């Protein structure tokens, strides 16, 4: 029971109280037309999941290794003086290795969504 724990308990309580007040005071009159999803005033057909681009997958997947790379530097910044010059060299080597992977990602154009349709540039030729 310091201020930290009391504050952390108190926040969800206030959220729940506001929710309870809204439930207690607002009217509640569901009916079929009101219950429809709002899509610009019309109705759309249910569809198979959209086909998505690979860059959408790749941003989320590549977040994890880069995030781990960044978070692995926390022990270094918390120990920099103790490990001073030896650890400075080691952390440089570690960073350079990860930068090679960044280079691979950049040169492969891995997060670029390519507009499939492009203007036609073929010449017009006539067989006389």
């Amino acid at each position: 029971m310091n201020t930290f724990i009391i504050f952390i308990i108190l926040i969800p309580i206030v959220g729940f109280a506001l929710l309870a007040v809204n439930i207690l005071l607002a009217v509640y009159k569901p009916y079929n037309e009101k219950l429809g999803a709002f899509e610009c005033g019309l109705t759309s057909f249910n569809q198979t999941r959209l086909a998505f681009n690979a860059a959408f997958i790749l941003v989320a997947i590549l977040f994890l290794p880069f995030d781990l790379e960044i978070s692995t530097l926390l022990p270094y910044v918390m120990s920099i003086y103790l490990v001073s010059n030896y650890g400075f060299t080691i952390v440089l080597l570690f960073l350079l290795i990860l930068i090679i992977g960044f280079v691979y990602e950049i040169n492969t154009n891995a997060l670029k969504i390519n507009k499939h349709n492009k203007p036609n540039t073929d010449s017009l030729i006539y067989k006389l």
Binding site: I61, L64, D67, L68, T72, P75
Partner: protein, 89 residues
């Protein structure tokens, strides 16, 4: 060490007797690793020894990379079939 051991055993049983979906298999893998790390960290505290905590940190990093690769494999598997069956493997 009780909580880690129970988590590991129950996660393993959930993985094995999973007959519902493939995401449960992914989750059971992640939570088995969590249970192992919990056991290790308790022993690290009781010995006042940094080796256990060092191994636990490495385990966390490897679990991240393993998650990334496993989900890449799942997406590549999805690319040809467009769906995951409740036996999707």
């Amino acid at each position: 060490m009780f909580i880690g051991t129970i988590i590991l055993v129950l996660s393993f049983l959930g993985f094995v007797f999973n007959r519902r979906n493939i995401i449960l298999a992914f989750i059971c893998l992640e939570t088995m690793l969590l249970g192992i790390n919990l056991i290790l960290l308790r022993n690290s505290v009781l010995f006042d020894d940094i080796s256990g905590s060092l191994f636990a940190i490495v385990i966390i990093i490897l679990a991240g990379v393993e998650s990334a690769i496993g989900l890449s494999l799942l997406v590549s598997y999805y690319r040809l079939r467009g769906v995951i069956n409740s036996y999707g493997i």
